[PDB]
């Protein structure tokens, strides 16, 4: 088997290899990339997402979220406090303010250390889950707004027609803005392009050891666990790499920089943080290989996780037994 230590692999497609998205995902998985739970894709030097980002200040962040932490440095939950709307311009200015800017540091490793030591003592504001794309419509390759849809994948593989659409989301980040330990909705893939700004650091557990993570999480957040058997779906728990080492949880880390794609694979748990003001775009996608992961995906039936319109149909078709109890959580 390829990639038996489950390392994060980095790919450098040629522009010829960058034409067929589905094919290159399949290629990466033939080299074992999926075993890590995450891969890096460096686009070919010829490729451009768009001409410039000169005009993006006028994008509105309707609901910025202040990420308030509770707990110890390496084991904490965060809750999202809703703030007043602001433009990307206002957000970027806020991200560069003395209160919120990235501190002095030698390298990513020094900054990682400061993040984990000082994360809980601060409340950065995130512009997350904003519907839209910054890909130019004339960008034909790896345009996240022009991928085949999950519904069409489901229909090609299983013969069933369902409602739903699937569109990209933008994420405006600043120093310390954090994404908690999670898999994608329905354990789908995700693809994330870092359009501009400072880096994003990612941690990931191999899908074949996801249950080990889940078990640690139940021990670390014992109340949350009683409340909901898929409480990582709530996207609030943080666990540091030190804590993961101490408890024997296999994992890897990598930093994504501007102009790079990351792909998460079905049931690859991930978490991470932003180094400073940036903007990423992301979307879930599926392959034939996803269908069984979707069949087996854990669901939140405590009602905290509150998920998209399009997820109804996935659960309804792939998880008909779960569908009576799950939709009562969604309503
Ligand atoms: O970019 C973020 O903050 C979170 N991104 C992801 O979890 C993803 O693309 O799967
Ligand atoms: Mg604008
Ligand atoms: Ni994700
Ligand atoms: Zn729940």
Swiss-Prot record:
Domain of life of the native organism: Eukaryota
JmjN domain ranges (all copies): 8-50
Catalytic activity of the protein: N(6),N(6),N(6)-trimethyl-L-lysyl(9)-[histone H3] + 2 2-oxoglutarate + 2 O2 = N(6)-methyl-L-lysyl(9)-[histone H3] + 2 formaldehyde + 2 succinate + 2 CO2
Annotated GO MF terms: chromatin DNA binding; damaged DNA binding; histone demethylase activity; histone H3K9 demethylase activity; histone H3K9me2/H3K9me3 demethylase activity; metal ion binding
Keywords for the protein's UniProt record, in alphabetical order: ADP-ribosylation, Chromatin regulator, Dioxygenase, Iron, Metal-binding, Nucleus, Oxidoreductase, Transcription, Transcription regulation, Ubl conjugation, Zinc
Primary residence: nucleus
Family label: Belongs to the JHDM3 histone demethylase family.
Function: Histone demethylase that specifically demethylates 'Lys-9' of histone H3, thereby playing a central role in histone code. Does not demethylate histone H3 'Lys-4', H3 'Lys-27', H3 'Lys-36' nor H4 'Lys-20'. Demethylates both di- and trimethylated H3 'Lys-9' residue, while it has no activity on monomethylated residues. Demethylation of Lys residue generates formaldehyde and succinate.
Protein name (Swiss-Prot/TrEMBL): Lysine-specific demethylase 4D
Coverage span on the entire protein: 11 to 341 of 523
